[PDB]
RNA sequence: AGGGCUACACACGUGCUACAAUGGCGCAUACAAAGAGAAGCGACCUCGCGAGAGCAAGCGGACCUCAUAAAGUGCGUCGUAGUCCGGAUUGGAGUCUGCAACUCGACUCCAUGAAGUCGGAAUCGCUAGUAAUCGUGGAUCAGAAUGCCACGGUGAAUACGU
């Protein structure tokens, strides 16, 4: 869009728990058009979350979110002199976007026996700040703040 | 002849589908099962398939069209 | 384990660890396990030696292992020997069942060395 | 227009409809299981192949009527895509009109 | 392959020339353009000259050479390598 | 009339299938849309694991056939293995159409079942029911599609900006 600013598509809230953020997490977790299995695995993993870290779904999910909530990020751009990444602020919507993306991509790996097991693994380890999600969060927090050439 | 260098020349059996059994010596060792002989052979005898020399009566039957 | 001159694995469903025998896939696996009368989801370590002998003298009916090997070997050998088109296809190491070769004949030809 | 191929085609359709209903039952001798004998069925096949191979209805190429093109044929119109499209544009193809949905 | 309910296949000219030859043949070459005919157990001992596109390559009919076609033993393309 | 366009030290372009648990298999269970059909579709029925074969009503069709949609849903099974992933290749036994399946058809059964652990440089498509995946049908057509065209089932991501 050279002359447009196309707003974000409006999402429905997850009819099970009211959380639209989780409904978006489902799609971000969804692959191949299989939304039935996506909602199945996400609900199962939230159950496992509540029963593993005690705190219920709509709280452990958030604490797993902020604990990886990305602050800033570098982005490729050039205006003159040389090519270099530039640290830029990621919007709150883009913040929890990157959070959900990192979380689901992590949960897709470390697969041992089940989807909900590995998903709750990553969720809890993110909340406690020892997962790989938080390791990539730390890397993004180091990379961005390693260089702040210009504001 | 010499020893320890020449092959073994045991007396074996030459049994062909002709049904003739000949007692030949050779470097074969085992009972030898043959296909055609001085008897029951095209050149030697008038019968084209002679007798036996191939039980291919086997699949002709499966299709059996005159 | 000793059935079929082979050492079929253990702690695996009987339908499945019966497949480790040349000459038996999953159809003949179920077929022998039924014609001999054995449950499907019993692991190999869940089988007694009487049922093992039952498998010994039941799978016998289907030719298997070394014997089939020899059979297919002599089959392709008579192919080569007869002087047929398929015999030459076998000698060259090319598709024999009528595939394309200008490209995609890899399983037979082998990977791209030259 | 290479009327040699079109003469081949007309001769093939003529001879296919000529010895039609002969090879029809000569093939019916062969699909029934009560071929009385191998000879009933077997002798039929030989007689079938005595009948001109140029009188089979599989030998026809079904070429377009105006131009005799082998490819692009359409059993609805009897014309190649080119001739059918020019006729469709000129209106000589009834009921036909550029589709859009 | 060919359906069993229909039987085997051999062109009439080939079948009849083969009979006229099995009775009276000492390899007076029989040249067959038919490569699709099947090999009958009555052709054992023959070496029919079957076409391959330009040349009548001969094929000696043997016992094991029964359940295949005359074209099976007449290659058609001459490949040697690059 | 025969063979070739199907040749094959090789390189590239499209496309399919996969490398697996969001998955493989078994059982049961539901939801389409569109079209074609008369020298065609062909119900049922009987025989054949199966390809189909015999039987054959009805249908020139909002009436009869294709034709069961599949993904899905619940149960259990497989437990991260070149494997119960794959399914190339090859041997044997068939079915179908056609004068005829050797070159050189399709499919079916049985049998080992290979590469393949997500892919170098680079590079393609897509802004909403669209990508992605699932299946369906038509043309051509005696037989022969993963292509083409058409149809529906689930169904997302991000567009800050130049
Ligand atoms: Mg001495
Ligand atoms: Mg060709
Ligand atoms: Mg646009
Ligand atoms: Zn003899």
CA of A11 to the centre of ligand 3 (A): 21
Strands E49-51 and E31-32: parallel
Nearest Cα neighbor of C18 from C70, C64, C72, C49 is: C64
Write down the residue that tokens 């953020």 correspond to: A21
D42 touches strand F (CB under 7 A): no
* Residues A33, A13: Cα–Cα separation, whole Å: 19
DSSP state at residue C98:
S
| In contact, E55 and E78? CB cutoff 8 Å | no
Half-sphere exposure of C25 (CA within 13 A, CB side): 1
Q: What is the 3-state secondary structure (H, E, C) of chain B?
A: CCCCCCCCCCEEEEECCCCCEEEEECCCCCCEECCCCCCCCCCCCCCCCCCCCCCCHHHHHHHCCC
* Residues C34, E20: Cα–Cα separation, whole Å: 56
Ramachandran angles phi, psi of A22, nearest 5°:
-70, -35
C42's tokens: 């019993």
CA angle E58, E64, E69 (to 5 degrees): 55
Q: Which residues of E touch C86 (CB under 8 A)?
A: 72
Three-state DSSP state, E32: strand
**What distances in angstroms separate CA E55 from CA A61, A112, D8, E32, one per listed residue?**
81, 66, 28, 11
Strands E49-51 and E56-58: antiparallel
- Quick check: E45 contacting B, CB < 8 Å? yes
A129's tokens: 């700040």
What resolution in angstrom units was achieved for this structure? 3.1
**What distances in angstroms separate CA E67 from CA A80, E61, E62, one per listed residue?**
80, 11, 11
Question: Exposed (0-12), middle (13-18) or buried (19+): which is E13, by Cβ within 10 Å?
Answer: middle
| A11 found inside a domain | no
Nearest Cα neighbor of C24 from C49, C50, C52, C55 is: C55
Half-sphere exposure of A135 (CA within 13 A, CB side): 6
Length of chain C: 114
Chain E 10..39 CB hits on strand F (< 7 A): 33-36, 38
| C11-19 contact pairs (CB < 8 A, 24+) | C11/C43, C11/C44, C11/C45, C12/C43, C12/C44, C13/C40, C13/C41, C13/C42, C13/C43, C14/C38, C14/C39, C14/C40, C14/C41, C14/C42, C14/C43, C14/C44, C14/C46, C14/C47, C15/C40, C15/C41, C17/C43, C17/C44, C18/C55, C18/C59
CATH, range C2-65: 1.10.8.50
| In contact, E40 and E18? CB cutoff 8 Å | yes
| A4 found inside a domain | no
- Positions of E strands within E1-82: 31-32, 49-51, 56-58
Give residue A130's domain range.
Answer: 20-147
D45 touches strand F (CB under 7 A): yes
Strands B32-33 and B21-25: unpaired
**What distances in angstroms separate CA D12 from CA A60, C51, D16, E23, one per listed residue?**
81, 68, 6, 39
Buried b (16+ CB within 10 A) or exposed e, C36-73: eebeeeeebeebeeebeebbeebbeeeebbeeeeeeee
A150's tokens: 């210009």
Phi-psi label, residue A78: left if phi above 0, alpha if psi -120 to 50, beta otherwise: beta
| In contact, C31 and C14? CB cutoff 8 Å | no
Determine whether the interchain pair E45/B42 forms a contact, defined as Cβ–Cβ distance below 8 Å. yes
CA angle B42, E25, B61 (to 5 degrees): 65
Nearest Cα neighbor of A52 from A139, A132, A105, A119 is: A119
Rg (CA), chain D: 20
Distance of CA A26 to the CA centre of its chain: 11
Distance of CA A1 to the CA centre of its chain: 26
Beta bridge partners of B33: B15
Three-state DSSP state, E53: coil
CA of B9 to the centre of ligand 1 (A): 17
Ramachandran angles phi, psi of C85, nearest 5°:
-65, -45
A54's tokens: 């005690």
CA distance B63 to chain E (A): 6
* Residues E40, E54: Cα–Cα separation, whole Å: 25
DSSP H helices in chain C: 14-17, 27-35, 49-58, 65-82, 85-92, 106-109
Which nucleotide is closest, CA of D20 to its C1'?
F39
- Report how many domains make up chain A: 1
Strands B21-25 and A84-89: unpaired
Q: What is the 3-state secondary structure (H, E, C) of A15-28?
A: CCCCCHHHHHHHHH
C103 touches strand F (CB under 7 A): yes
Nucleotides of F under 7 A from a protein CB: 1-13, 21-23, 39, 49, 53-54, 71-74, 77-80, 84, 88-106, 109-115, 127-128, 131-133, 139-143, 151, 153-162
* Residues A87, A74: Cα–Cα separation, whole Å: 4
DSSP of D38-100:
HHHHHHHHHHHHHS-GGG-TTS-----TTT--SSS--TTTSS-HHHHHHHHHHT-STT-----
The CATH number covering residue A108 comes to 1.10.455.10
| A131 found inside a domain | yes
Q: H or E element: which one contains A133?
A: helix A132-146
* Residues C49, C36: Cα–Cα separation, whole Å: 14
3-state helix vs strand vs coil in chain C, percent to 5: 50, 0, 45
D70 touches strand F (CB under 7 A): no
- Report how many domains make up chain E: 1
Describe the strand order of the beta sheet including E56-58 as a list of residue ranges. Answer: E31-32, E49-51, E56-58
**What distances in angstroms separate CA A39 from CA A51, D48, E80, one per listed residue?**
18, 65, 61
Question: Exposed (0-12), middle (13-18) or buried (19+): which is C32, by Cβ within 10 Å?
Answer: buried
Write down the residue that tokens 């709280």 correspond to: A59
Write down the residue that tokens 């004949």 correspond to: C105
| In contact, A25 and A64? CB cutoff 8 Å | no
| In contact, A49 and A120? CB cutoff 8 Å | yes
Q: H or E element: which one contains A89?
A: strand A84-89
Q: Give Cβ neighbours of residue A126 (< 8 Å, ≥ 6 apart).
A: A64, A67, A68, A103, A133, A134
Q: Give Cβ neighbours of residue B21 (< 8 Å, ≥ 6 apart).
A: B13, B14, B15
D12's tokens: 């093939």
* Residues B11, B24: Cα–Cα separation, whole Å: 5
């Amino acid at each position: 869009p050279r002359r447009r600013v196309i707003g974000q598509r409006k999402i429905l809230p997850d009819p099970k728990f009211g959380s639209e953020l989780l409904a978006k997490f489902v799609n971000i977790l969804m692959v191949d058009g299989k939304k039935s299995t996506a909602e199945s695995i996400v609900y199962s993993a939230l159950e496992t979350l509540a029963q593993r870290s005690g705190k219920s779904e709509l709280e452990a999910f958030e604490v797993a979110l902020e604990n990886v909530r990305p602050t800033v990020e570098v982005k490729s751009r050039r205006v003159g002199g040389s090519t270099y990444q530039v640290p830029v602020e990621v919007r709150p919507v883009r913040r929890n976007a990157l959070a959900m993306r990192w979380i689901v991509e992590a949960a897709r790996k470390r697969g041992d026996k089940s989807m909900a097991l590995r998903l709750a693994n990553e969720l809890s380890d993110a909340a406690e700040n020892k997962g790989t999600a938080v390791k990539k969060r730390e890397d993004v927090h180091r990379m961005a703040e390693a260089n702040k050439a210009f504001a | 002849m010499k020893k320890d260098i020449h092959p073994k020349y045991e007396e074996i059996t030459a049994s062909c589908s002709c049904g003739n059994v000949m007692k030949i010596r050779s470097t074969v060792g085992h009972d030898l099962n043959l296909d055609v002989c001085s008897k029951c052979h095209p050149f030697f005898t008038g019968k084209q398939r002679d007798v036996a020399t191939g039980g291919r009566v086997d699949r002709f039957n499966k299709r059996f069209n005159i | 384990a000793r059935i079929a001159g082979i050492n079929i694995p253990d702690h695996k469903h009987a339908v499945i660890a019966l497949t480790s025998i040349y000459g038996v896939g999953k159809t003949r696996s179920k077929a022998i396990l039924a014609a001999a009368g054995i449950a499907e989801d019993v692991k190999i370590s869940e089988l007694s030696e009487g049922q093992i002998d039952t498998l010994r003298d039941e799978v016998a009916k289907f030719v298997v292992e070394g014997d089939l090997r020899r059979e297919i070997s002599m089959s392709i050998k008579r192919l080569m020997d007869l002087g047929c088109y398929r015999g030459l296809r076998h000698r060259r190491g090319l598709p024999v069942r009528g595939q394309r070769t200008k490209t995609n004949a890899r399983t037979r030809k082998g990977p791209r060395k030259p | 227009a290479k009327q040699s191929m079109k003469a081949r085609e007309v001769k093939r359709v003529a001879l296919a409809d000529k010895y039609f209903a002969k090879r029809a039952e000569l093939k019916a001798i062969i699909s029934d299981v009560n071929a009385a004998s191998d000879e009933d069925r077997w002798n039929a096949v030989l007689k079938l192949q005595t009948l001109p191979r140029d009188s089979s209805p599989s030998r026809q190429r079904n070429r377009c009527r105006q131009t005799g093109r082998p490819h692009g044929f359409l059993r609805k119109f009897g014309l190649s895509r080119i001739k059918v499209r020019e006729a469709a544009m000129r209106g000589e193809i009834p009921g036909l009109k550029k589709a859009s949905w | 392959p060919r359906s069993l309910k229909k039987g085997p296949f051999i062109d009439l000219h080939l079948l009849k020339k083969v009979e006229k030859a099995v009775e009276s043949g000492d390899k007076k070459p029989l040249r067959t353009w038919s490569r699709r005919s099947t090999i009958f157990p009555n052709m054992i001992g023959l070496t029919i000259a079957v076409h391959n596109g330009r040349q009548h390559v001969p094929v000696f009919v043997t016992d094991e050479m029964v359940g295949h076609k005359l074209g099976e033993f007449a290659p058609t393309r001459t490949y040697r390598g690059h």
